[PDB]
Design a protein around this ligand. Structure first.
Ligand SMILES: [Zn+2]
Ligand SMILES: [Zn+2]
Ligand SMILES: [Zn+2]
Ligand SMILES: [Zn+2]
Ligand SMILES: [Zn+2]
Lengths: 362, 362, 362, 362, 362
């Protein structure tokens, strides 16, 4: 009779779906009676089995509409219209809490009744990560406060180290823990601005492997990335706003996002150095490598690079009140979960096993 | 049933909202009953709580409308249309007063009971800023008269100074007080029109850190800024109109905007120098530097580079009749609030502190 | 009167038809009575005769409809939408089984009573192919497990060999058995992203004939392939996601696909070599060469490079349980047909022939 | 009342019209009573006088429609939708037969009651062509079987010869006899792919005048075309499919089409040579030139370059059963036509006249 | 109420109006009553006064129509559609007669009672032009026959001469008499296709001032024209079709148009020279030069370079039967008017004047 465009927009806003084709393809699965849906019975996809029921009726009418895409276009624009509002209205801590909430939804399913994730292998990831840097759980908390506070000339951390030292991994988990885009400044001074535009609306940015000049004697390729950063002081310390680009034309004007610079031991100009409020030197450690050699699951399952392993470390080490009021109920809920499955002496042993480089789970 | 396109346009026009996705996002939040509206109950957004009730009805119908996007378009074209009308019809002073009303709009909120802004700190900034130059409030006033009057060969100021000397800060605060855009002219003589086109319809312009080839011994980079500036004499003194490029074509033909040129102490050709009606030299001052070290909040909350700090200086030093008739009543309103809050002896101790380099609030 | 958009979409969805002009072309052939339909009477096209009757009615109305094109669009967006859904929700094994069902779909037709394919010849290809490498069926199986498992640093195979050595053939057959795209990386270090973007949503990738600067004496060209590969270590071992360029912008962010690298015997940097979990060397064999000279049909009917030849090898050598539960019944169906058609002693004489270099069917 | 979009699509599909403007302009000529049409009475254009009658009525209503182009747009898309189907469904021999049928329609009018063509001048063209190469009629048949069979590593012929030797002419008639696009590989390695995309959906391709390096001593310009061909082995012998481009993005992936390479006597690398299954050396012959000097009509009327002269040679020399069943009825029909107007001794004399270089028709 | 789209299309078709904005502009002038129409009363525009009355009614309704633009579109597509039809169906002579009718259309107006053209002056031009070359009217006639016949290797004329020698003038007059475009080939060998594409659907072409590298001593520039021409032998002699580029792609495939080549006395390669069926040499003549000095009106009113001057020469010298049957009656009409206006003895004195270099009207 008359397809309800509203319900479709609701489903989209509930699934957080900003892809028109992906929305179309999912709403259409609902057109079949749920009174038999195996996707639901078998709980295949949460984005499906939690809405099929409610939307059967409307999806059945939807499958007969003459402009299903136009409808999905408005549902999507709605998700984007909201993503644009929060962009200007939400505070940074709220930005961070939403990210956090989205990661918990991911964790709720991973370690749930209908999920594959093995939490024991993920706490092993926490043990390995907490052995990568001293007072690692305090570091992540600090980093998070640095990013949310986002204060001029104190918004960037510099990860320096050889390859396979750990900065890339920690810098990756940190990225996913907060949401944000990595960028590449090892480009020609004219190709730069396009890349810099990527950081639009982002919470944080990670300048992956910035290459410098000097050090070719130590087998390190000369690049202009370091040189470009020293020319992007305005961006890094962000005291005033900046104009960002995309679509071959100027878009947003804002405070460049705070972040991390991953580097490979190139000499740094004193003017560049001064832009980093914190520096972390990573050196490859033998036991850590050996631990992995005897714990393939941490790599093959991409656990130690996952921002989830870091959120997990927080929930496990950090005091509840350190989180936002709004999300604390969900945090205590996970602490109890965790505390109920792992004792301290068990988690501690995992850390001991890493130190001995033998296999977290031995 | 029958959504009102004019009611949405009203909302857009009173929010000065030129963003479609944003307008859409804002409006859809009014579909919910405002009775138990927390956003209103907590008064978290002026652009929301001030209009939710009046638009509840309309928004609720808008929610079930099939072309929400199209409705928002017309509302935005109406706002762009109004801005196109002011570009061609308001006097520069009417342009400056609207800008002032807008900043004031923020001040009511920042310093309101919902805002988080500390007015003592923003007055600490007036004091610090008032120690950056001799007779600073008169310096600001003149600039303003200069910009509004926009008179041939007497519309450009040259801020010359080392680094961390204040020119960047004052040029930034001035940029925000009047509206306008910063421009980079240290570019390829052909990738110039690109940037010069950003000046379209802008009130004033600021060429930041113009660099010259001449000079190098004193540690100053190359850049072609000075060079380029000398080839834009017609844009600078504005005796006749000019053709500005944007959208990768020739849009607006207008008198190029007045403004400032920030520079780092190079050799300025006589022909270029003759283009500036006034030139200010900034030399690093220890007390101002030490003072910041002890007055972190000035930089951390981006106060000294705010056009709001400067608007507070005019309201605090200058007489009412100096403002546009249309706004005075609002200024007087502020003077009183301010005079009720700070004694001249208090404000004076503040400048004394900056003078002794010890943080304004001691 | 009132054409059914859903009936056309059904037709499009069951033909996996993503082409609009093509869908339109197909559907308009159903407007004619199927009673005296020669295309059906002669069963010349599965995508036609299998659906003509069910769609006669609809097609006849479609013929007098004013927006046939628009109808076809939605039907295509529905198919693209389904493909967008599988990209994000199927496991790699479910991806491999669909691919297998499709190839099987062809096999039913090629070897059917309407097809022109000689099954003895395609079994001559299994034999020839089974003489190209030791334990070839186990080699194929592993690759498959490798690709499906897509595990960090253990997802790339290196096919190294001269020319006319078999690597090109096997890499082509393997490419068709799993789906995927061939890629050329011997390009300008900037005209690279272009090609790397072709890997988007693909199941596996094949970098064909990667060339290196090192080496030249032995008559091998220059090319920058090896060079480039070494700069794509992150795309190869797939520990973390990557941003792929297509449409002249940044589309999909995904784990780069697993695959093969075909190479012509250059010097492979240790850092690059460490990127391949397995390496196969192909050396020209006389009997295989002579055998082709006498087994023209193998090359002339493009059989040895077919993924169909290889699917026939798995069905012929491998046990049922090795296949996905969902498909086995169809394989068993084929095994029987095959076992009823060829005796092991016959197939063995075939390999003996390839061994003596005299054409498989003597 | 209501314009019949269907009839318009039928006319378009009957005229094989894929040009919207050309369709619009022709359907509109039908709006006038045919009961007086001089275009019909005078039989000016077959595309007009064979449909005016049937379409008057509908064209009269058409001339009053408010969106004649939208209608013509669907008629066209229909012709393209069909051209796309046959692209995937028709066999190569059917592809060739359709071409053949289209050439007969052209010949039916040329030598008909309302046509200008003089068949005697066209049989003179056949006599001249059959004197250009030994057993010429067997050559064309062979070439046609080579093209239809389209077998890997046996799909290309190489025409080598000085200028005005005859390869260009024969290669042109062959092109038109089969339908297909010529391409130019004498382009920069980066401009290549654009050109190569032209061969999409084509029956055959003709690489016109490929220039090499070496031979500048014999007054031959150095080019990179030969060099590019040796880099297009995959394309030439076509054992596996290839990706083709257009519209600045990737389109079809298919077996590159078979064809001819016209060359000017440059040395050929043994690796390139091996790609041509046949080579034909053309040497300018005196009597042939003299014959033309005394037979201007063969050139001024473009007869010896016309694919029609070749189809005519076939019908005249070849046995009916050598053609496809479907088209034989039409072939015997032309043989009788021909046999009724030209005796063997007459045609033979024409061949004798060419040999003597004096004028086919003397 | 209900505007007629066909009536507007009629207006567009009879004005040969291919401009949308222009058509719209013209039509809206008919909405006003034609009773007191001054434009009609004063007969200032044929494209106006000749149709105002018949369209008053329609135009008045058109004025209140909501989609005037869309109506005009169809009317223009109808005119473009007609032109697309003539491109493919008229004989070159029918093309030349339409062109002649059009120029004649102007002549009726220029020399009418509303026009400002002095016919004595335009006959002064025939005389001057008739002294520029021996047997000029026969020279014009031949060119015309040449162009219409468009016969292989006999379609290009070479106008070779110094400067101010007449070649430019005659080539311009000839260009206007037949229709066509001027082309610049002294360009980059890659920015050539651009210009060559302008020849699309044109009747004849004129390569103006082709320059050669050879030669320089005699004060002649460089340019690559001659060079390029020699690489376009296939475009020049038109034995086979060619692919022309426009819209930045490959549009029309056609026989390249016939025409003239204007040149300034360089060295023309034999291979290039063989491309011209006729070559005319222009050498500066004093009397012709002096004559202009005293016959300013010839240059000032752009008469000697007009195709109208030349059409007047054919009507004045040539016999009726030489024209197309379809137009003769109109020519005879003109001959009489002309013979009634000028005696042969008068016209002869005119040539005598040009001969003595003293202005034709003395
Ligand atoms: Zn379901
Ligand atoms: Zn509210
Ligand atoms: Zn059928
Ligand atoms: Zn007719
Ligand atoms: Zn009028």
């Amino acid at each position: 009779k008359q397809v309800s465009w509203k319900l479709v927009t609701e489903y989209a806003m509930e699934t957080k779906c900003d892809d028109v084709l992906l929305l179309l393809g999912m709403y259409l699965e609902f057109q079949y009676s749920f009174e038999m849906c195996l996707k639901c019975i078998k709980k295949e996809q949460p984005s499906h089995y939690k809405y099929h029921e409610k939307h059967y009726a409307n999806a059945a009418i939807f499958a007969d509409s003459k402009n299903q895409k136009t409808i999905c276009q408005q549902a999507v624009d709605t998700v984007l219209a909201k993503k644009r509002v929060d962009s200007l209205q939400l505070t940074r801590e709220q930005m961070l809490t939403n990210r956090f909430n989205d990661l918990l939804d991911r964790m709720d399913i991973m370690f749930g009744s209908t999920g594959s994730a093995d939490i024991e292998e993920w706490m092993a990831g926490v043990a390995w990560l907490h052995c990568l840097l001293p007072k690692m759980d305090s570091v992540v908390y600090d980093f998070l406060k640095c990013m949310v506070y986002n204060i001029p000339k104190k918004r960037y951390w510099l990860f320096k180290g050889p390859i396979d030292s750990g900065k890339t991994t920690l810098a990756a988990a940190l990225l996913e823990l907060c949401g944000g885009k990595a960028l590449n400044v090892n480009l020609p001074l004219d190709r730069l601005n396009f890349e810099l535009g990527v950081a639009i609306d982002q919470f944080l940015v990670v300048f992956e492997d910035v290459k410098g000049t000097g050090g070719e004697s130590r087998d390190l390729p000369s690049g202009q990335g370091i040189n470009n950063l020293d020319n992007l002081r305005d961006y890094l310390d962000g005291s005033v706003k900046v104009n960002l680009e995309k679509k071959h034309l100027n878009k947003r004007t804002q405070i460049f996002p705070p972040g991390i610079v991953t580097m490979n031991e190139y000499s740094v100009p004193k003017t560049l150095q001064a832009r980093f409020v914190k520096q972390i030197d990573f050196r490859p450690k033998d036991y850590l490598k050996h631990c992995l050699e005897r714990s393939e699951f941490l790599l093959e399952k991409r656990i130690i690079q996952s921002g989830i392993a870091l959120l997990l470390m927080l929930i496990w080490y950090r005091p509840v009140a350190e989180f936002a009021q709004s999300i604390q109920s969900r945090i205590v809920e996970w602490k109890e979960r965790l505390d109920k499955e792992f004792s301290l002496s068990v988690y501690q042993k995992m850390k001991f096993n890493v130190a001995m480089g033998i296999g977290v789970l031995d």
